[PDB]
Design an enzyme around this catalytic site. Structure first.
Site, PDB file in Angstrom:
ATOM      1  CG  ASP B  47      -2.289   0.657   0.928  1.00 24.05           C
ATOM      2  OD1 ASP B  47      -2.338   1.911   0.927  1.00 24.05           O
ATOM      3  OD2 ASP B  47      -3.299  -0.062   0.699  1.00 24.05           O
ATOM      4  CG  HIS B  84      -5.645   3.658   1.127  1.00 25.48           C
ATOM      5  ND1 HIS B  84      -5.022   2.444   0.930  1.00 25.48           N
ATOM      6  CD2 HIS B  84      -6.966   3.445   0.917  1.00 25.48           C
ATOM      7  CE1 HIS B  84      -5.929   1.536   0.606  1.00 25.48           C
ATOM      8  NE2 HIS B  84      -7.116   2.116   0.596  1.00 25.48           N
ATOM      9  CB  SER B 222      -9.589  -0.205  -1.350  1.00 28.56           C
ATOM     10  OG  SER B 222      -9.808   1.112  -0.883  1.00 28.56           O
TER      11      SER B 222
END
Lengths: 292, 284
Positions: B47, B84, B222
């Protein structure tokens, strides 16, 4: 050498008209209610052969082959001189015809691969060479069956045997074997390994299924009640036939063998025993319906 | 080029003290009461990086690596400039410490693999490098909330190597790849109300950790994937304990599919249903 898993004959009957309790227990008739009976599914039964003339089985067998030295090695004679193979075949797919018994997947079709000849060293049982089982598995793959079903075991890890099992699952064919000295092929990670429970739900396997007092077909057009670990696997192979038809329809695509395996594990009922005894539990075909 | 799945920042919060609703929806606290919180499981989080100083994550990060050009390619600086990656990490395994939030597997360990730089973007080469590292580091689960439009054979091969090494590979179904590969566990999202996918999990109004010690509520596809990745950490610990042996990736995938709740939608939409950790208990 490869041996049939031991089993006990409880009683023989001339005639009957019922759904066997093991078929009820895995909830097969509830899946029939969804329109799912094993249509166009082909299961290779690698066992003692089959009485192709049994009224419950004549409409389900699409062919067969003899891999043993029986009948002088006649490849066309897959007669059952033991009784076990005909019994297994009936549990998988005995026809719904208002007579006799009915199997788990009564629309499915059977490919009868005889690799086990009666065993003089153990009267009542049957025996075969590793090469014969290897040949039968490769034959099943060449004939593009959906499921391979065995109730046998040997003590040796023979590479050509593991290779054929790996070849099967690489072609998305399910391989089911009873877990009974008799460790392979059931001990291979690729194989779906099956244990047995009693009809009341009492006792490295993946699932259990009923194996006690199982009513099914025997040669001569008759019926018999068997008990033994190998009685559990035809319930599982028949269940997989229903599951493959159902799931490939609901998912609207062909499913891989790992996905079809997961669909079987979704359809299990834990029984409260340790996993080393029940694995994932009893094959229980309505389990996701119950959850929803 | 690989991209984050688009998501919405719903709320930004200074302080919270609660189990997020998505962790509750998949029934994780019920599994904690079986003694199963993810201990000794390692999840590679592929990520935007992670804030290693967040009080809810500082005790969960076993290590990390930067594959981007951020911070001059210093492979040890996996800082999260986006947020995120930190949010994903908190959903998987935020520490249970009587403050902030709690992840699905609050005793699991995280390997932070930064492959996206500021939405956020990364080269396919960076993701494959990270997948190879995760395999070398013998992680149990690889979690990707990202996607690309291209079927790159090198990406497919790295996914195959992970699965061949019995590592679970989880990816959000965005941007079709790598989630569209058969080997990957493809995760769709649902609301907390229940409104080629393998499973779904909550993706809407998901509260988790963001850099600087703060919290945020995100909504997006997600956001579902970290729920499944943390759930798989519980499932692997639980199942290997009860089966008394290491399980293969196909067996563990089946243990996931066993722990799903069908929601009444076509399987083309919901796959096997909502990850629902107590399903076999309910069935019994």
């Amino acid at each position: 050498t490869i041996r049939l898993i031991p089993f006990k004959i409880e009683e023989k009957l001339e005639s009957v008209k019922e759904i066997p309790e093991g078929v009820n227990m895995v909830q097969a008739p509830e899946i029939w209610k969804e329109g799912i009976r094993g249509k166009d599914i082909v299961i290779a039964v690698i066992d003692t052969g089959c009485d192709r003339d049994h009224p419950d089985l004549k409409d389900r067998i699409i062919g067969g082959r003899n891999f043993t030295t029986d009948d002088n090695g006649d490849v066309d004679n897959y007669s059952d001189y033991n009784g076990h193979g005909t019994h297994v075949a009936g549990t998988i797919a005995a026809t719904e015809n208002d007579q006799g018994v009915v199997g788990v997947a009564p629309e499915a079709k059977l490919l009868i691969l005889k690799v086990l000849a009666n065993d003089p060293n153990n009267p009542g049982s049957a025996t075969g060479k590793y090469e014969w089982i290897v040949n039968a598995i490769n034959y099943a793959i060449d004939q593009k069956v959906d499921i391979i079903s065995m109730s046998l075991g040997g003590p040796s890890d023979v590479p050509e045997l593991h290779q054929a099992v790996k070849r099967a699952v690489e072609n998305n064919i399910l391989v089911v074997c009873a877990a009974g000295e008799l460790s392979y092929p059931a001990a291979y990670n690729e194989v779906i390994s099956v244990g047995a429970i009693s009809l009341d739900g009492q006792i490295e396997i993946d699932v259990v299924a009923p194996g006690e007092k199982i009513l099914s077909t025997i040669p001569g057009g008759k019926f018999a009640v068997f008990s033994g670990t190998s009685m559990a696997t035809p319930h599982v192979s028949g269940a997989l036939a229903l599951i493959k038809q159902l799931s490939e329809k609901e998912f609207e695509r062909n499913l891989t063998e790992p996905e079809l395996y997961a669909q079987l594990i979704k359809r299990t009922m834990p029984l409260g025993f340790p996993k080393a005894l029940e694995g994932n539990g009893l094959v229980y075909l309505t389990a996701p319906n119950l959850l929803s």
